Amino acid sequence: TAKVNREVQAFLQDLKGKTIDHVFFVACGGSSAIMYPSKYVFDRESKSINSDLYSANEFIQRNPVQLGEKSLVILCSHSGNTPETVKAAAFARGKGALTIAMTFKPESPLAQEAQYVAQYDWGDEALAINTNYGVLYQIVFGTLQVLENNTKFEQAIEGLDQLQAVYEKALKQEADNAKQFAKAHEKESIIYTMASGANYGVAYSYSICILMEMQWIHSHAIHAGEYFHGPFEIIDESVPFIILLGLDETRPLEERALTFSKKYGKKLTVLDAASYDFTAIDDSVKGYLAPLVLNRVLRSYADELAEERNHPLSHRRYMWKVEY
Amino acid sequence: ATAKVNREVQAFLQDLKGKTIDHVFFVACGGSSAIMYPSKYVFDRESKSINSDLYSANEFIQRNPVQLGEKSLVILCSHSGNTPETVKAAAFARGKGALTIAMTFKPESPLAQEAQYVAQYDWGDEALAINTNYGVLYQIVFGTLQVLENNTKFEQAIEGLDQLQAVYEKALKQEADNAKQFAKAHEKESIIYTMASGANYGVAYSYSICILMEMQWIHSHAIHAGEYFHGPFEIIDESVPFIILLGLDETRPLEERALTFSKKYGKKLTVLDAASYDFTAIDDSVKGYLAPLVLNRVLRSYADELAEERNHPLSHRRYMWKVEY
Numbered sequence A: 001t002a003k004v005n006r007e008v009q010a011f012l013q014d015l016k017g018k019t020i021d022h023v024f025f026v027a028c029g030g031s032s033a034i035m036y037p038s039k040y041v042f043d044r045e046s047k048s049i050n051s052d053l054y055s056a057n058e059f060i061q062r063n064p065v066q067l068g069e070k071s072l073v074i075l076c077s078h079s080g081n082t083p084e085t086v087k088a089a090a091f092a093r094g095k096g097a098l099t100i101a102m103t104f105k106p107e108s109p110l111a112q113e114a115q116y117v118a119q120y121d122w123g124d125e126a127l128a129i130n131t132n133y134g135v136l137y138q139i140v141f142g143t144l145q146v147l148e149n150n151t152k153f154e155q156a157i158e159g160l161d162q163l164q165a166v167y168e169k170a171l172k173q174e175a176d177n178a179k180q181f182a183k184a185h186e187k188e189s190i191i192y193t194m195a196s197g198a199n200y201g202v203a204y205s206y207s208i209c210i211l212m213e214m215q216w217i218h219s220h221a222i223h224a225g226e227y228f229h230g231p232f233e234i235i236d237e238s239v240p241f242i243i244l245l246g247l248d249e250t251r252p253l254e255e256r257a258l259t260f261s262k263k264y265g266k267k268l269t270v271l272d273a274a275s276y277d278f279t280a281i282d283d284s285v286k287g288y289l290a291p292l293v294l295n296r297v298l299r300s301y302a303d304e305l306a307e308e309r310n311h312p313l314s315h316r317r318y319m320w321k322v323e324y
Numbered sequence B: 001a002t003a004k005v006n007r008e009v010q011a012f013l014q015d016l017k018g019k020t021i022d023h024v025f026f027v028a029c030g031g032s033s034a035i036m037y038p039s040k041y042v043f044d045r046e047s048k049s050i051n052s053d054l055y056s057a058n059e060f061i062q063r064n065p066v067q068l069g070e071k072s073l074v075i076l077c078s079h080s081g082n083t084p085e086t087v088k089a090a091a092f093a094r095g096k097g098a099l100t101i102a103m104t105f106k107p108e109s110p111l112a113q114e115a116q117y118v119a120q121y122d123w124g125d126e127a128l129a130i131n132t133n134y135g136v137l138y139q140i141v142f143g144t145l146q147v148l149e150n151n152t153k154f155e156q157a158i159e160g161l162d163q164l165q166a167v168y169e170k171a172l173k174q175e176a177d178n179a180k181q182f183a184k185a186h187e188k189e190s191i192i193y194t195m196a197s198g199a200n201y202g203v204a205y206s207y208s209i210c211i212l213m214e215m216q217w218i219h220s221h222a223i224h225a226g227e228y229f230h231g232p233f234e235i236i237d238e239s240v241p242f243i244i245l246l247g248l249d250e251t252r253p254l255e256e257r258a259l260t261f262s263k264k265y266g267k268k269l270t271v272l273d274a275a276s277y278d279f280t281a282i283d284d285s286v287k288g289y290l291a292p293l294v295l296n297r298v299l300r301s302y303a304d305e306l307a308e309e310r311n312h313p314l315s316h317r318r319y320m321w322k323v324e325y
Helices: A006-015 A036-045 A056-062 A083-094 A109-113 A132-148 A153-184 A197-215 A251-264 A286-309 B007-016 B037-046 B057-063 B084-095 B110-114 B133-149 B154-185 B198-216 B252-265 B287-309
Strands: A022-027 A050-055 A071-077 A098-103 A116-119 A192-195 A221-223 A241-245 A268-272 B023-028 B051-056 B072-078 B099-104 B117-120 B193-196 B222-224 B242-246 B269-273
Touching (some): A006 A116, A006 A132, A022 A036, A022 A083, A036 A050, A036 A197, A036 A286, A050 A056, A056 A083, A056 B037, A056 B198, A056 B252, A071 A083, A071 A132, A083 A109, A098 A109, A098 A132, A153 A268, A192 A197, A192 A251, A197 A241, A197 A251, A197 A286, A241 A251, A251 A268, A251 B057, A268 A286, B007 B133, B023 B037, B023 B057, B023 B084, B037 B133, B037 B198, B051 B057, B072 B084, B072 B133, B084 B099, B084 B110, B099 B110, B099 B133, B117 B133, B133 B154, B133 B287, B193 B252, B198 B222, B198 B242, B198 B252, B198 B287, B242 B252, B252 B269, B269 B287
Parallel strands (some): A022 A071, A071 A098, A098 A116, A192 A221, A192 A241, B023 B072, B072 B099, B193 B242, B242 B269
C-alpha cells in the first residue's frame, strides 16, 4: 500500500463498498495495448466482474448496453489530449460509470473529464512500478483486492518494485541482440510479431506503434494460437518474425509457434521471458509481469533499429501534422 | 420465424428456456473464430444480463476464465469438426459444467461428439444465407437472447436472414467487374491491408488471415478503423493496397473517417460499402448486424478472381494438412 500511487490509493479507498459488475478498458493504440495484460488478469482472477476492452471510438459507438452505474471505466492517454479517449471518458461518466484516467499530463482534457486521475512516470528515470503499466496494475490488482478480496495485491506490488532490477538485467543481457536485430532488419519491409495471452498486447503495440507508426515497416501481430489456422502458411526462410514467449498459462501456444517457425522459417527474433531473472518475483504473478519486461526489452530493439535505419522514432508524416 | 430455424437449434432453444446463463463464450479457431465477431457485437448492443467473451480455442483453454462454469454457454465452431483445439475446448467447457453448442459441417465429427448440442450448417454454392455458418450462428445468438432476455429482434433477424440471400445475389452481380479489376490490380502485390470496425472487423480479419495469408500467401493485417489513426495510418502512401469495408452498424463513422483519410494519402484502395447494396427488405433494427454477412460474401468473389489471376488455388497449402505441427 505504501508503494501505491497516492491518487490510486484515494481511488481504492473510495471504491470500497461500491457495487461494480463490469470494467471497461478504454484507450487508443499504444495506450489500448498496455491494457491487454489487465484484461488477462481479470479473466484469470475476477469471479464477479465482467471485463471488456475496446478502442475509444469503438467503445463509444458500440455503446455497450451493460455500461452504466455499476461500471468502472479505466482510460489512458499519454498526452491526455487524444480526442476519442477524452470523449470516451465524458461518455462513460454521463452514463453514471465510475471513471479513472491515467495520463502523463494532469492538466489535460482527459484529466478534466475523468472522475479520478492517476499520473504515471515516463522517461529514462522512471521505475517500473511507476510507469504506465505499473500504475495500471496498481489500479487493477487494487480493484480486485477491494471489491473481491483478491489475495494477489501484495505480491503484484512487491513484484513491480522488484521488476526494475529485472528490466536493468534484461536490458544488459539483450544489448548485443538488439544491435544484431537492427543490423539484420535494416532493409526488411515487413516484420511480423507473435505472442499469446498476457503478452499479445506487447506484440500488437510493437507492430502498430514501433514498426508501422514509428518506422514505416509493415507488420501484423499474429496470435500464437490463431497462427496454426491460417497465418503460418506465410512463413518461409525469408519472412521475419519477432516471437515472444512469456511466463503465463498460454506459454505452450508460444512454444508451439516457435517450434514450427524454427523448422520452416529462419529470420526469427525470439524474446523469451524464461531467459530473464524472475527469482525475486512471486510465482503467483510472474506471468502477469513478464509482458512488462518483454515490452521494455523490445524498446531497446526499437532504439537500435531506428538508429540503423536512420529513421528516428519521433518521425511522422501524418500524426500531429495533417488533419484527420 | 421459428419455422425457418434449424431443427437442432430449435431443440436447443426449447431446452434453454428457464436456464440460468450469465456468460456466453465464443470459442473457435481462425476463420471459425472470425465468424463470431458480429455475434459479440450483437451481444454488446443487445444483452443486458449476459457477459460475452471471444477467444481462439487454445487461448480459451489456457487462459481458463475463472467465470467459466455452470452458468456459462459456450458456442463453438469447426467446419470439419476435427480442429483439435476446438474439440478440446468443447470437452474442457463441458467438464466445467458449461452448456455447450457446437456448429459444424460434419455431424459425425469429434467436436460433435464432445458438444452437448450440435447444429449443422450448409456450405457450398447451393447454400442459402440463413443456413450458412453465419446464418446458423445468428439463429443461436438471437434465439438465446429471445429465450433468456425476451429480446425483441428475433423475428426481424430471422426474416432478415431469409431475405439476405437475395441481397447476396444482387451484391455479387453488382460487384462482378470490381472483383475482376481487383484481381488484375493485385496479381503481384506482396501485401494487402484490410480495414473495418464494429460488427465488420471479423470479416476483415478473416480476409487477412484466411484468404490472403493462408490461401494466397499474401501478407496482410486487418486494421481496426478506430485504431488506424493511432499509429497504423503512418504506413499508407500511394503504393500500399488497402481493402476498406464500410458497414451499416453504429461504428460506420469510424470506417468513413478512415476512408476519407485513405483516399487523400493512399491510392490503391478497394472499397466495399454495404450502403451500396440493397437492404430495403431488411428491417432497420438488424441491417447493421447483417451487413457483415453480405460484405463477407462479396469478398469471397474477390478472392475467387484473385486466386485465378495469380494461378494460386484457394485450396493450396504448404503446411496445413501436409506437415506435423
